[PDB]
């Protein structure tokens, strides 16, 4: 029996208001500058190295992706800002490396491709973090992975930062081994030479094909051997399909074109007999009742400015349908029950500064979704944290605690949406990136850092201040705007979306109109692992 | 008329009983008595009584879910014996129905909040209820009074001691310590009194404008 | 392939008998009385603590479990006759309790309310007894519990049989706790003020939701504080939805009026996320071929005229179907297979006085079907039980614990209904109410002690003239029948369906007529609890 | 490295204080009265039966017990005072049964034996409770038990408390069948004629031992044969040791006088192959610094006095040695570490009213100890509750909620002596006899009830007040002492030690002095069990 009505929630937002213009406007503005921006990083290496690549024969890494895919279906690339200027002027359009998650034969699998385009090939310690955050979301939510190797090796003037430590570069191959080890699938095709980087990659794998011509498997490059040994001789008597298929038997197969390869492929997937199967209540789903794009004019693009959550989660969650927990208690902050694409969820999301109150209700709700085997969705916005005489009196930072505590023995999957201003402890509170959620994802006007820049100003004015008046020269009048401005400036520029994204703190930026598809998609991969039993320390009274 | 509201009170039934019936379908124990609609207890007949809008008055049926599948409503001293059950014609559905010996067959269509029989003599509108606390009244009968979530200086408040209130305007813009937000009126009614003057400070759950009762 | 024919059990009994004639008409005086007062009983506390009730806005306890079940769905009471003038001459209609069994939300779950009506929902002892069962009933068979409280405390002038004692008061608790570790759902619903009896139970409890005005949660009332600490204040400032939601906590949820408790209640349980899964193999059901009203010309209100078992099977499985095990072999028990509701079942019944080979028989039968995993059902009419000299030679006794062993040991759902006269040992041969059977009913005929007032008249009387024959002046001849008859008149009073039936010694009595539906709602709640391995002890030979 | 040296509790009182003159007389009064009592219980039945016992040549059933144990061993008798008055003219010393705890050939198990001195051995209601208490300590201490039968039956005059109920007789049988299923032995020893109440026992139990004359074993006495089948013939030919052993096989072994019984008891038990082993770190052990008699001139006879905890650890724990935790905080409550008899422990303890902070200090430990798998011992004195309008604001009934999970989900095995008075629901907070203890004590000067006589005056006085003056005329000036004196007077006669101890709430009254002693014995029985998995439900914040 399903037949009780439930109040809706989300209201009308007066379009004719001047607000909702001024936010409209904003928002449209950040949104189309991360469309330019991702356009020119999609054009790839640049035209030089794409007329050479077609020039080969090969297919340009797009197109391959396009082919292996499932046709017609979705695909979620990730951190498509990676080393967006971060270098000092080489450019790396996506990292050199293109992963994501599709739909192949009917069986959701990781797809990590490199781009020879891009600097032949050659691992940057961004392109090494960015596979192995790759790999561990696989293995995590327990999904089979296909690589598509065409790289040449490490960038050899950064040595210290991709060989030696201990998640740098080689860790790729311990994670592939307790992949295998635990029954997780590995697949590599070879459409490119490799020398040492790519070359145990094949061999590593269980399955393996190799074009006939444009694919080499060698340990050692034409020019690592002369220098080495004093001897030369042609990769393709090291690599080479036929040479190693006849001989050696590092290739299971034998591929004449690139598409042959992709075909074979997917004929490898459906042999490779996996049966999904979920573990939670199903119910039919239905669209929110309001328009998403209407969040522009609700959110705009300053932080001072406050929006109530339940609008957003109104333009969310299906039918606007949501049934709030301990409203009335600690309603700084928002907990509930809905249903996202037919799958329950658990919704947590901030208004204001937090105080204890509401991070006991946080606690409580945790255990309750733990105990019901329910996912759970973070919202923060954290404008402000927990702090004053008398909140750290009765611990309020003791309740902190408890947050912390029932976030990290959770273990039902966990994402992470950064909608909001994030600063401060709250972070690690709200399940911040360092609590391993299995997702996380930042709109284009979130700021996050540690510290406000006009906090730490402050800051560093009373902690010199006192210092110097104990050295007799105490900080004087004079320099206090000359000392303020530096530290506003630097950590405006750390806060920035672009500059996080730049790193592989988040899995990627998105415009809010787009937020609920992704959303399905994530939790729809994420529900391929079997949940398991969630046990908590000590709950410290 | 009398009988009429008997036949829209079993249509609610018989509706709600096949959609007892389809979330049975779908579930892995279709079998189970429980699934059944009888309605029976134990030692004991169970009784239902039902509220229906009729134009102008409301009207109170007490259904009596019989032993043997017969249906038992009395309205105003006058009791019933109705039998009844649904079947389609082409995708429209006919409630076909014996109240007291008399039977006939009647389209039944059921919209949100209001009952449908049709007829070649004519046709006949009932209204469901809808209860106050969904009709979200409740939810402004929730706080008594508004009140302030933070402590923090009022820059100016819109409304005066006397002034007319409208639906979603602000009672006034309330910044403190890396903080703007703005105070809605919480009702429609005219206010009594503002209760804090210009550059004012109200602590946690503290009243702001005083409102007239509604 | 099911196309085999089966033979049909059953007869069709001669009407014109006067035999019939006279069965049925004692069957229907027994089932009028009963009929008449459970009508008297669900009145309630009367007139007046109804119009108090109603006076206050609360609906009445009976509306409150209605609107709360899935409309259109059968409800199991229990009980019903608890406290049936078991005081002196406090009239405590249904325990002041109402419990039982029903479908929420398309989810089985047990609804436990208050009924403030009675007494001031005073706990009495037998209130307490009544509550218990039910919460043991919900944990073997794995169901959710929701609570009604509007009781005020413990009876103040029985505190000795109600606060102290292990099975007593306070072990309610000891089961939500219990309850709630293992996964097992909580619910409280405040309707009523409650002093230190309900108000741990909305703590005790995972969710909670009280009315505004006439739920509030308060440890002490204010005669308790004003008695206690010297100072008085009203009960809404310790409870109060409002003031507990605001502040307390304790309130996860704040409604307006009965009706919207309900509701939200409704939500919660969908909200839930929980799943029924069977783990037993389900066939198509069908109606028995004979009318079930027959039994009472069948069985009559006669312990002395015998009925053969089979008949009643006939009455009762689906399509009247059996397929009876080693039948020649100790023909004085029944054993088979049979279906009903489409669930498969193995029915013990007895036919009359055991012997060694019934026994052995009922041992082998009770190993198959726990080996295969199949519920039992017991129809026990114990005229008699296994006494003689040549009996106890060969140890029918060790047979009669063999029985015991195998019926202890099983670890399937067993059903219990005493069709007939029950007496001796047998009791605990077949599954009686101290071996934990799920369920355990009886007939309106049926009369249960230890032995017939004759047997305890004759052994009393043997004893006494031995010993006085010792002592000089033997029992004489005089006193016999003054002896015999307060034993027998005593024997009488305590095996009356109705005296028991106030106590909880059984779970409630049914006509025969309804007894088929009852037992199918039955077996599909214990099919939520999911069977596991049963162990036996160690088979004396 | 164990050398740092630690601090120790407890002083030197007074001896020359009045106070403490006075505390010893009353505690010496109250400890000679236990004495004198508990002699003239020890002589049994009376004179008469003894001489009768004696002349068919069986042994008392003390020198019975006497020569079964270990020799120069320990034995720990347990609930002397059941039945202490608790019948209207009926006699029963030790209600009739001898139960107990014992180390036999090495290994500790459970002895109970019947007296056939008090009233031919039939089991009273009183007998049952007390049987089935030593079964289910057994089942949970996981020890193999030991049964000297010798009784005749039921007590017919009562037998609506003793036959149907679940709890009821018969119940023995179903533990005996699961204690064999799970591998705790059992053993059955025979010394008199049963009838079907020791004639199921033997065949319940695996092994068997019957005496040549004096041991018959029939489910059917010849009266019952006589006066139910018309036939008569002596128990001899349906019991006997050779007729049962020759052909039945029931008596697995044939012993001719008592002793030789005794004597092959012990030989089966060393074949038992059972080793016991722990899981606790051990240490050496030392006597406490200070005589236990203090304890008599620090606690006294008045439960208006207060007296602090401390006292009682030093006089009680090895060397005096503790370590309090979190001392300032929650002073009312104490709680810490401590080592008995080379077993670690965790001492919980009441020093006065009950408040919030204390709750949650409570819970704290509790979790901890749960964690490191440390045994639980309570020490509760509640002469008042948590009652209060700004206590119950902020949810003080929600932390006692937080004391009664926390207890309830542990399952280390837990220990709890009434030091004090016991009132409210506290009982329930500090592992009161509902939560299931293991062990339970009260000294003899403790009084429990749910509340103080006073408090439940003053309630009644005001609600008829209330009521009344509603009625018109009110609860008048006169009749306030006439209504509460009565009160009084009953919660005094249900709050005495030997009142409780007349039931079975709790195993026993043991003066002060003993007490160290009996505690090592329980614990070092405890052991047997292997510590399992805590698991807690959800904790409401
Ligand atoms: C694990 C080790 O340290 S062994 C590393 C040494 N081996 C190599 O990588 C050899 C160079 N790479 C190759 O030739 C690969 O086999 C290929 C075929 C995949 C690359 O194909 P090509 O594009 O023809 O190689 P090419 O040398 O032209 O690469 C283009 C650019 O990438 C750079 N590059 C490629 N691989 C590497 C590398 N491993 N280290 C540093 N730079 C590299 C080159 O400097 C070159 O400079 P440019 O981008 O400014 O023009
Ligand atoms: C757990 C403890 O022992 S502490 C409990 C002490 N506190 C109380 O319960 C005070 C009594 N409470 C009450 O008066 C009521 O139960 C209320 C106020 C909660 C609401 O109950 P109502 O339905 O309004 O009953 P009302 O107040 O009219 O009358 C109380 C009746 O309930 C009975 N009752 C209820 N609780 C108790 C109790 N704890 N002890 C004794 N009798 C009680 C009384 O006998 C009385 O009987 P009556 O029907 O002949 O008058
Ligand atoms: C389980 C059942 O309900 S079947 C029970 C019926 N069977 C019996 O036990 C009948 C009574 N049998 C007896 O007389 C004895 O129990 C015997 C013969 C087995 C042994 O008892 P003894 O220790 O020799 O006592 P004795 O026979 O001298 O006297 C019997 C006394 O025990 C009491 N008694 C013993 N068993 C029972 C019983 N089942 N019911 C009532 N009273 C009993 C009698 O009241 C009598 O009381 P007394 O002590 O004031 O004299
Ligand atoms: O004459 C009436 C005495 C009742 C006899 C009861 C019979 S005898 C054999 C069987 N065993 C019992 O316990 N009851 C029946
Ligand atoms: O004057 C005598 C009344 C007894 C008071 C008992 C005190 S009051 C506070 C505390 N709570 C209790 O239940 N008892 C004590």
Same mark, same amino acid.
């Given at each position: ?5 439930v109040?809706?929630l989300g209201?009308?937002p007066?379009?004719g ?14 949104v189309n500058?991360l469309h330019?921006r991702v ?6 290496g640049?035209?030089k190295?794409?007329?050479l690549?077609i ?7 797009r197109?391959?992706?396009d082919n292996?895919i499932?046709?017609?279906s ?7 800002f ?6 000092d002027?080489?450019?790396?359009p ?22 020879a ?5 050659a691992?940057?310690?961004?392109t090494v973090?960015?596979?192995l955050?790759?790999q ?7 999904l089979?992975?296909?690589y ?6 490490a960038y050899?003037?950064?040595?210290a930062?991709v060989?030696?430590?201990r998640?740098h ?18 697949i590599a095709?070879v459409?490119?030479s ?6 145990y990659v094949?061999?590593?794998?269980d399955?393996?094909?190799?074009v006939?011509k444009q694919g080499t498997?060698?340990?050692a490059?034409?020019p690592l051997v002369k220098?080495?040994?004093?001897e ?7 690599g ?5 298929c006849?001989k050696?038997?590092?290739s299971?197969?034998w591929?004449?074109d690139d598409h ?10 459906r ?7 979920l573990?939670v209540?199903?119910?039919?789903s239905?669209?929110p ?6 969040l522009?004019?609700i959110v705009g693009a300053?932080?001072k ?6 609008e957003v ?22 907990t ?12 947590v999301?901030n208004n204001g500064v937090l ?6 209700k946080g606690?409580?709700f945790?255990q309750?979704?733990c ?5 759970l969705?973070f ?5 402000g944290?927990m702090?004053?005489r ?8 003791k309740?902190g605690?408890?947050?912390v ?7 039902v999957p966990?994402?992470t949406?950064?909608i909001?201003?994030?600063?401060g402890?709250?972070?690690y509170?709200?399940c ?6 299995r997702?996380?994802?930042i709109?284009p006007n979130?700021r ?5 820049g006009?906090?730490?100003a ?7 201040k006192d210092?110097r008046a104990?050295?007799g020269?105490?900080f ?5 705007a ?10 405006e520029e ?7 994204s730049?790193?592989v703190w ?14 399905g998609?994530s ?7 079997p ?6 320390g000590?709950?410290?009274? | ?5 008997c036949?829209a ?5 018989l509706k ?10 779908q579930?892995?124990?279709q079998?189970?008595?429980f699934?059944s609609?009888?309605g ?8 239902r009584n039902?509220?229906?809008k009729?134009?102008k008055?409301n ?8 032993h043997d599948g ?9 009791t019933?014996?109705?039998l009844g059950?649904?079947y ?11 109240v007291n010996?008399?039977?006939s067959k009647?389209?039944l ?9 049709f007829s ?5 509108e009932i209204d469901i209820?809808?209860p106050?606390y969904?009709?979200s009244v409740?939810?402004q009968?929730?706080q008594?009074?508004?009140?302030? +979530?933070?402590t923090g200086?009022?820059?100016? @408040? #819109?409304?005066?001691? %006397?002034?007319?209130?409208?639906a979603?305007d602000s $009672?006034m813009?309330?910044?403190a310590?890396?903080?703007?937000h703005?105070?809605?009126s +919480?009702?429609?009614?005219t206010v009594?009194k @503002? #209760?804090y003057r210009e %550059? ?7 009243? $702001?404008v005083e409102?007239e009762?509604?």
């Amino acid at each position: 029996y399903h037949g009780d009505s439930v109040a809706s929630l989300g209201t009308q937002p007066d379009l004719g208001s001047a607000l909702y213009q001024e936010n409209y406007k904003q928002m449209k503005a950040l949104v189309n500058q991360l469309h330019e921006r991702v356009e020119h990083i999609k054009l790839g290496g640049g035209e030089k190295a794409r007329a050479l690549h077609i020039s080969r024969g090969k297919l340009l890494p797009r197109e391959r992706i396009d082919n292996l895919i499932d046709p017609g279906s979705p695909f979620l690339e990730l951190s498509q800002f990676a080393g967006y200027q971060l270098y000092d002027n080489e450019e790396v359009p996506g990292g050199g490396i293109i992963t994501g998650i599709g739909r192949v034969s009917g069986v959701e699998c990781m797809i990590i491709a490199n781009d020879a385009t891009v600097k032949g090939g050659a691992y940057y310690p961004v392109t090494v973090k960015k596979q192995l955050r790759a790999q561990e979301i696989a293995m995590q939510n327990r999904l089979p992975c296909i690589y598509l190797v065409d790289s040449g090796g490490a960038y050899l003037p950064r040595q210290a930062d991709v060989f030696p430590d201990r998640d740098h570069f080689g860790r790729t191959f311990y994670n592939q081994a307790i992949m295998s080890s635990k029954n997780i699938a590995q697949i590599a095709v070879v459409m490119g030479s490799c020398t040492a980087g790519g070359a145990y990659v094949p061999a590593m794998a269980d399955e393996n094909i190799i074009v006939r011509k444009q694919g080499t498997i060698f340990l050692a490059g034409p020019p690592l051997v002369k220098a080495a040994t004093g001897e030369e001789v042609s990769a393709e008597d090291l690599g080479g399909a036929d040479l190693h298929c006849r001989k050696s038997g590092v290739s299971d197969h034998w591929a004449l074109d690139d598409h042959h390869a992709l075909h074979l492929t997917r004929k490898v997937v459906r042999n490779l007999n996996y049966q999904k199967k979920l573990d939670v209540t199903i119910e039919p789903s239905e669209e929110p009742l309001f328009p998403a794009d209407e969040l522009y004019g609700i959110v705009g693009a300053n932080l001072k400015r406050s929006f109530d959550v339940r609008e957003v989660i109104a333009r969310i969650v299906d039918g606007s349908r949501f049934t709030e927990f301990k409203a009335f208690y600690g309603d700084t902050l928002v907990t509930g029950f809905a249903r996202i694409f037919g799958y329950p969820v658990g919704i947590v999301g901030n208004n204001g500064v937090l105080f204890s109150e509401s991070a006991k209700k946080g606690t409580h709700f945790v255990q309750l979704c733990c105990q019901r085997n329910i996912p759970l969705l973070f919202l923060q916005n954290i404008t402000g944290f927990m702090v004053g005489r008398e909140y750290e009196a009765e611990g309020i930072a003791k309740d902190g605690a408890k947050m912390v505590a029932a976030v990290a023995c959770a273990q039902v999957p966990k994402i992470t949406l950064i909608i909001g201003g994030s600063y401060g402890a709250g972070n690690y509170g709200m399940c911040g990136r360092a609590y391993s959620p299995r997702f996380l994802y930042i709109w284009p006007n979130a700021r996050i850092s540690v510290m406000g820049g006009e906090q730490a100003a402050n800051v560093l004015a009373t902690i010199t201040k006192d210092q110097r008046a104990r050295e007799g020269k105490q900080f004087s009048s004079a320099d206090e705007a000359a000392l303020k401005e530096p530290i506003i400036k630097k950590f405006e520029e750390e806060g920035n979306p672009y500059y996080s994204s730049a790193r592989v703190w988040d899995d990627g930026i998105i415009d809010p109109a787009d937020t609920r598809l992704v959303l399905g998609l994530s939790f729809s991969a994420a529900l391929n692992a079997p949940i398991e039993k969630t046990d908590f320390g000590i709950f410290r009274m | 008329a009398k009988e009429s509201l008997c036949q829209a009170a079993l249509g609610l039934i018989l509706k709600e009983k096949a959609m007892t019936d389809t979330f049975t379908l779908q579930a892995h124990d279709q079998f189970s008595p429980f699934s059944s609609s009888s309605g029976r207890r134990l030692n004991i007949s169970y009784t239902r009584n039902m509220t229906l809008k009729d134009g102008k008055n409301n009207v109170a049926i007490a259904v009596t879910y019989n032993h043997d599948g017969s249906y038992s409503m009395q309205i105003e001293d006058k009791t019933f014996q109705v039998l009844g059950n649904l079947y389609s014609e082409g995708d429209c559905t006919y409630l076909k129905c014996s109240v007291n010996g008399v039977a006939s067959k009647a389209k039944l269509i059921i919209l949100e909040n209001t009952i449908y029989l049709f007829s070649k003599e004519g046709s006949i509108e009932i209204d469901i209820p809808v209860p106050k606390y969904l009709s979200s009244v409740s939810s402004q009968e929730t706080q008594g009074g508004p009140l302030a +979530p933070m402590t923090g200086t009022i820059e100016k @408040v #819109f409304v005066k001691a %006397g002034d007319k209130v409208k639906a979603g305007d602000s $009672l006034m813009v309330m910044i403190a310590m890396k903080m703007e937000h703005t105070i809605k009126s +919480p009702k429609d009614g005219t206010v009594k009194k @503002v #209760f804090y003057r210009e %550059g004012a400070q109200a602590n946690r759950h503290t009243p $702001l404008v005083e409102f007239e009762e509604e």
